[PDB]
Design a protein around this ligand. Sequence first.
Ligand SMILES: [Zn+2]
Lengths: 218, 58, 159, 142, 103
Amino acid sequence: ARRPARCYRYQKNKPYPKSRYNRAVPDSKIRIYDLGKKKATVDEFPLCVHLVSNELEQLSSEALEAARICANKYMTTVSGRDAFHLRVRVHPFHVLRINKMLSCAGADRLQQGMRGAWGKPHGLAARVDIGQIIFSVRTKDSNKDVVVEGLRRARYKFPGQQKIILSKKWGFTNLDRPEYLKKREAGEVKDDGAFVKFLSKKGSLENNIREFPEYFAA
Amino acid sequence: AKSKNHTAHNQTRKAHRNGIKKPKTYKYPSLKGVDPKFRRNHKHALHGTAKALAAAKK
Amino acid sequence: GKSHGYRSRTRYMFQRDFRKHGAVHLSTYLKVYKVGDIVDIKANGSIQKGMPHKFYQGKTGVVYNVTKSSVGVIINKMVGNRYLEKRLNLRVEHIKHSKCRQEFLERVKANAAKRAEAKAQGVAVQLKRQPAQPRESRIVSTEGNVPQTLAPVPYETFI
Amino acid sequence: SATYPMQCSALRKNGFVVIKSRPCKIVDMSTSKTGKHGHAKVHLVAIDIFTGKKLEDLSPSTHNMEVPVVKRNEYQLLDIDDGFLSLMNMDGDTKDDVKAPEGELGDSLQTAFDEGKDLMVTIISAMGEEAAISFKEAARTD
Amino acid sequence: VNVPKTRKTYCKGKTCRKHTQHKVTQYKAGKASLFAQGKRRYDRKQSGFGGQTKPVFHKKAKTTKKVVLRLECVKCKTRAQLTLKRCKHFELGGEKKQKGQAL
RNA sequence: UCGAAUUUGGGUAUAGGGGCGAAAGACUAAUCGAACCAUCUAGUAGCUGGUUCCUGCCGAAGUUUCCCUCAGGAUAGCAGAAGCUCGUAUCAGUUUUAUGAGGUAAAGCGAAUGAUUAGAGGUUCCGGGGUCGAAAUGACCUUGACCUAUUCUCAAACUUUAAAUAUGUAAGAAGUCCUUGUUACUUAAUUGAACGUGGACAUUUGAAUGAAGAGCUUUUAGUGGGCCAUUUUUGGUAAGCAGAACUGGCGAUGCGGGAUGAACCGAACGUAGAGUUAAGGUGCCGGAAUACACGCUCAUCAGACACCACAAAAGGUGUUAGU
RNA sequence: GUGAUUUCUGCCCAGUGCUCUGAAUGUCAAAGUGAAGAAAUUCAACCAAGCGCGGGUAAACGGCGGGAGUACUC
RNA sequence: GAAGACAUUGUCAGGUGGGGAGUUUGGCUGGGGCGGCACAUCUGUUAAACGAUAACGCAGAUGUCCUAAGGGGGGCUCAUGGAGAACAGAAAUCUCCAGUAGAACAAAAGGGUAAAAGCCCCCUUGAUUUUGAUUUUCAGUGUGAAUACAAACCAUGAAAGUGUGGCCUAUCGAUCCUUUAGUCCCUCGGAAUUUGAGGCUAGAGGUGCCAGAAAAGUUACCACAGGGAUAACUGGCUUGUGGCAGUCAAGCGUUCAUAGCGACAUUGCUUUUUGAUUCUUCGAUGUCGGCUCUUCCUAUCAUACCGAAGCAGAAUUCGGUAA
RNA sequence: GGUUGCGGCCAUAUCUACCAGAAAGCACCGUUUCCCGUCCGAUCAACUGUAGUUAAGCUGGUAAGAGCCUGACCGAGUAGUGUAGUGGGUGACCAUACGCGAAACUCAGGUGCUGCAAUCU
RNA sequence: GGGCGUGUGGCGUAGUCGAGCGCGCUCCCUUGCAUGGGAGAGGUCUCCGGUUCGAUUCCGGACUCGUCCGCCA
RNA sequence: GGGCGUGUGGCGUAGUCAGCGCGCUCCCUUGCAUGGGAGAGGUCUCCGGUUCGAUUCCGGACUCGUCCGCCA
Ligand SMILES: [Zn+2]
């Protein structure tokens, strides 16, 4: 009962989010976005691999769900359920419309054609760009060959072209590997639930000393 | 039998055929819309000025 | 149906601005306009009386009438294939003097000063403005400025 | 004005109409196409509020029918004498112009006033003629 | 709406030329006289054969009328008219609105 | 069907909104849901068809507003004709300089509004579930809220910020400066306002470029179905679909090229001669190198040129070059 | 109007018509009557039939519903 | 003989009167009809940062309400949160603190507003008179709405000032006719007085199809002028839907992803489905099905030769060259 | 230079937490007969400048302070965009040519200036 | 052809994952215009698989029944 | 497919930005006839918004009953 994704592949319309002018959309099919060992610390998983688009198109929420299930299932079967952290870095906010025509014989007796042809919501999609990350996984350096294969299996569920790039960053942060290493040898990083908070030279010295004590322990 | 609703095609060409002449400006523009208390005094001021110039160059 | 009211499509045009709402400062009431002054029109949304229409926002005109709290301004409006003369009564919160006119008057008085001082010698005053001429010959030296060779950089991911 | 126009399709059930210069209240509405090409016609069956007669009219749907203004007003009885009720308004105004009802409503109201209940009377105004339709008893404020 | 029964307003009655007290009423049209020229012409045109000779209006759309107040100066008896906007309910009896009291 | 509610001759009666009808709107002289003839009558038609010699010059519109207006008119616009007042300017689909105005593209969300993923630390006179508890505004875990510092992703009807392109004004003589006349306006007041008298400043007189004359008036035709292309863009799965914005076109237009074609590329046209080219081409059709140079490809459906006359995901120790 | 014979033609007069020798001021023309006026005229009373009120009529046009209990009953 | 000043007849007046006559029975519109109002308007957006800008585009709204919810002045600060106080608790009243508006301002939405434009109190009628000018829509017509003055007369405050309805953007109506107010002015044409009538200036009674006809159907008995500007065939563009084919592989298959299948996803093809559109045809292209007859396509049911199997034989299934 | 009265621009001026303030001026402060206003002389009104106090207001300083302001060749000539091609690509879209040119980020600095009149060790 | 829902003892019918009632008649007791009372029998919850610990109950498939929409000019 | 109406205690329903009557269950009184008073009983179909407050005002959803879906 669902149209093929080629009818909604391209970004032909303006963004159409769920708002107080829509008020009746179907809920998204993808619901879980962070999975694997999502409660892991930052220095547990140094390596990060990205599935990144090469197209300017719309990805369906159904396709996002299918790719998430495929990559998660493959990596938990080959490497264990808590050896990786996968994060879906796109969210379906664009709403797809359909002008539903009757498929009955002699439909033109009651069709009215293209008059008042404004559509009804039937699906949700995420609008991506050139070089935008869809999937991001962080793991140890011993799981590179299985997370590349997991992303390669997940790439079949997506239209268009995607690339698998091994990032130069440490995990889900934005510093490089030696930059993060020379930062964490000092005490100016401090862990959070999954992420890490950093020290800055601004701010009040009392707060900067109750937090982050080992760097000032010089 | 629907038809074309509205367009602005060819309109700037039609205007710029013999078009977009600026209005002619003049010395001594019109005093309509100017404040009547100003004009009522301005009449007497010009009348006195004309009488003084006539008496000077009589 | 369609809607073309007096203040249609004037949302961001007649918003005030960020962090300068409230009452207006007293310089706009202390400024003095005379007949023949050239003024810019920018409406103040805080004052609802004497408002200009949305067409005249950012338009520049000439004062022709001065009343108690307002100013009469003449604008030239393109209607069809010609310009028409439009007379507007605007409160003084919606107008300010045009700075280009006072810049030109400063050029006039400095220009007359130059002509007056150089008339005592006759030194070919050359009072017209000139645009940006092509730059002439020069000698650039390498003392402490030996050239540094640059090359194109190879490609990287940078994510 | 006393009365205002309306469209037949704009009319609906339990609404007031003017039929043959009488205030009437609709009980039935039915629309049937005149011809396959043509517009539907509205057949209206209504009951006069004052007299209880059944009046029907059919019209084009696009036609405009006259509609009265009906006001229902709430009063307390003071006396029933000579077939004329005496009523008492909020803020203490009194009217005696209302004639007493002549049917089983009037009989029940007469017996209720004879045996001494405090009776709340609803009288309606439409097109310059006045009548009483129903009565209740005040459950509180005895 | 509600309008008070009296009003101090301008009177151009050639002796006042100022604000005097005025008693207000509502304007009523008055009966259409016979022997008005249009009525005589209409009767002459309607006599004979030919049926109805003039249009009779049917497509009524307004539900209200503009109310007209008749002001009457108490000194020199001169009268003025002024119209108001459209209102479904109108009254001249002054029952003033009161603020901090119950429903 | 054939002895009768039979068939039929002649005479006679009924005449056109009338007749007659065992009823079909049947018949009433090949004419009937109102006969025929003549006149009114050359009835009216916003609708279809046609509209008669040559050459020269200029040359459109399918758009604004109103209409029982939507196949039509009026009105403005576009066009022609007649000119008139002057003689290089009170010009300009242009640039520069100076100065305004704007809320789109972009960006932002550890900034307001709204949406939204994940943990962390706290708050229980201040939650809910279990377990331990006599019970407890009891305890221990868990889960929900709220707060605090973070984190992932967004917005036609969100925004602090904010372009590009378009867009207003000014670049003087109708100007600037000095002095002092008028007034019933205005001021406490010759204070000011406006218009003035007299005097000074001229060809670099106030940026560039170009001007092909500049300005003004009257009158009237046709038109008021448009369509296509690039870019922006709306509805739609889409359409040689429907609807907008700026420009250029076709209509109204031939010529060279795209084999062919209204719109594409090039270029717009008096009659000829010579030369050079545009776009496109140079094996032969076919005018012009089976030129030169470096590589790649062998297809048991090769490929061969924009608009344009289609092909995708996924693969291949085919072959080549790379990381 | 229905359409030989045979056998039957149930219920409904609220609506729309049709029909009364009923009862009688509600609607209520012209003429006529009264008042006011200087008159044109204005205002009232009175006011025929028909409407309106009250009956009849379906071999007149027509019409012949729902909710519970256990065909029947409410 | 009967009847008799009653019938009859004549003229007026009321009723009845499709028996008959005449006429009417909107427009837009992805054909028309039904539906809706995109028909007079308003807010935000589409709208592409001056202005303008379409669709039966999106989200909504109007035919009202108000003697205060208008005008002037004075005092005060709101939503919310925290901490307290008998009954009194989630919500009654009182007190303090924080509080850029997160409240309120009649209504739809968007702007604007903090010693206020909000809440409370005091006084009032400027929601008044006289005609002009200007802005929006625009033909620079009307109507509606609005802006700034002039000449009066007022309100309020100590005053400067403010006020010509509602904080701003919507909230509404020609000619003819009737009626009211003013001037108590002009005319009734042989001359006067008084009624009556007609004029001048300003309002009201209303046309919502909102620049403004007085208006029910049917036609299968039908007619005329036209239209491919416009529907019902084929053909053409598109392929949602229909049909057919792939890729990936969580699983089914005792065990085993792929012998045979194959979820969640995703890429295509076809024009033997039905839609969508309106390009051609309305001075006509004969419109279902069957019978008859020829040829073509392959996405192969059988026959020929083969490969694979969860092929022992028999039977079967999957696939290839093949029309 | 401090302070007061009236201001202009309206955070470099605001906010949070501390510290300091000679002189003068502001301020808190004392009182209810009179004018006046309140449930309440708390606000407002009036009287005294006396009985007192810098505790607060106010001013200034401090803070790897929050905010705000300025600058950068910091990001970045990046994103976006005007013009051009019989450019690439099935397409989606993307390079190049002639031009214009952001925002976030990062870093550095700053934290009221001033007009008129009066008055002050 | 497609969609949607349905399936309980001989019959009707109640079911939140932990098969009851009424009717038929088996027996006994108890009565003209023939009753009542008490103990009875009676299901593979349509079937087949998986989940659970155990499915009427949850899920997937099949069967069956009942509705709704569909050929041409 | 589209449009309209519909749900209030068992029933009838009414309504201002949940009431009675008849049912039900008790009690009391007096026939010929009775009547009275108490209670238990209603998330106003449901869910939101608006509003001091919503049966009432609006939006969305469910159920049921209707009416159209025609020319070729
Ligand atoms: Zn007077």
